[PDB]
Amino acid sequence: ELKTPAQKASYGIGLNMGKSLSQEGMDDLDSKAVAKGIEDALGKKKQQLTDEELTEAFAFLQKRAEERMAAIGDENAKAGKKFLEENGKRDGVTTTASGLQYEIVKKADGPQPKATDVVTVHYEGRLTDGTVFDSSIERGSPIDLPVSGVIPGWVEALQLMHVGEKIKLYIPSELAYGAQSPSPAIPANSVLVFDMELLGIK
Amino acid sequence: NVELKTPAQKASYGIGLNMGKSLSQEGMDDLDSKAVAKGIEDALGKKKQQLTDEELTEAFAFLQKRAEERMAAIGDENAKAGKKFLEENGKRDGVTTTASGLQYEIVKKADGPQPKATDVVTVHYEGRLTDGTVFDSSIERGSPIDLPVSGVIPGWVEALQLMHVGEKIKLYIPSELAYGAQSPSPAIPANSVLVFDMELLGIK
């Protein structure tokens, strides 16, 4: 029953809260328990479960969620190691000493950038599962970026690239974000696949 | 009824329990589990929103102003009730009213040393509101707690200094000598007089 404007807000509160908690790995959220829980609080009714039981359950949910996130990154690490292993054996892919793998789409004899240079580049970041995270081509505009002010994977690749060249990048996790994934779309230990074109040196 | 069996269910229950009490002290008495529980199923199933996000935000702010005035009234009512409780309890025999307005009833007398403001004290207590609703009980937790006299609320500071080691007293702390109109805890509403059954086990 959403007729009441109070219930309009009630629905939204549950809607927003539900979405927020779901992302925290609390897939196991049954609206039934919360329903009566609120009702007991609303009617000053007795707590069907005292704070002691509630405290224990909360910690369990936290640890379970933490260990789910641990497994996600650990499985992602193994998946990314595998992708690079197979991609490295592929003909047309060059593996550098750092483990960076690159495949030249367009070749050029333009100048090579240096660490003290700013470069205009067009890029499309993707994942091993193909989920696109950050794309200059999707935003439609070329982006000027400094060689020393970017992820270590791009730093190395850009210096190898000549002006006008377009390559496919397969940056290992260690040469990018690593297990530190402040980025939500990019989980921990995620190998980044990038389509990079060195439009010019600014 | 409700499962409340899965450790997930137990936890989900208290999210709503605390949420009801939190929102009730946020002026939102109008909340009903009819739609908040529905919302959880809708969102988790990625089912389409039953209301446009734009209308949702407008309603939130609509209730915000309604709840604001509601909070002022609930607080003023609790204050008048509390001050009246204090006056009536002060008229009772065995209740000593101090200059700060604090009232105390010595349940168990003793001639132990008197705690200084710098001392830490081992105390077993049972905090309750005027309606008997408990908020913090060292007894329900089962274990006494060592608390600093400087850290505690001004009502406890004064009372403990008057107490002696071994003494058990009943406290009637006015809102002014406690949290007051500010309600940092949902269990303690605004302008709420606190009732405490305290025993001074010892001084650390």
UniProtKB/TrEMBL annotation, chain A:
- Catalyses which reaction(s): [protein]-peptidylproline (omega=180) = [protein]-peptidylproline (omega=0)
Any one Gene Ontology BP term: protein folding
Keyword list (alphabetical) reads: Isomerase, Rotamase
Does the keyword Transcription feature in the UniProt annotation? no
Q: Which GO MF terms are attached to this record?
A: peptidyl-prolyl cis-trans isomerase activity
Q: Answer yes or no on keyword Hydrolase.
A: no
PPIase FKBP-type domain: which residues? Answer: 116-202
Q: What class of enzyme is it?
A: isomerase
Q: What is its EC number?
A: 5.2.1.8
Q: Which family, according to the similarity comment?
A: Belongs to the FKBP-type PPIase family.
Q: What is this protein called?
A: Peptidyl-prolyl cis-trans isomerase
What is the species listed in this Swiss-Prot or TrEMBL entry?
A: Pseudomonas aeruginosa (strain ATCC 15692 / DSM 22644 / CIP 104116 / JCM 14847 / LMG 12228 / 1C / PRS 101 / PAO1)
The stretch of the full-length protein covered here is: 27 to 228 of 253
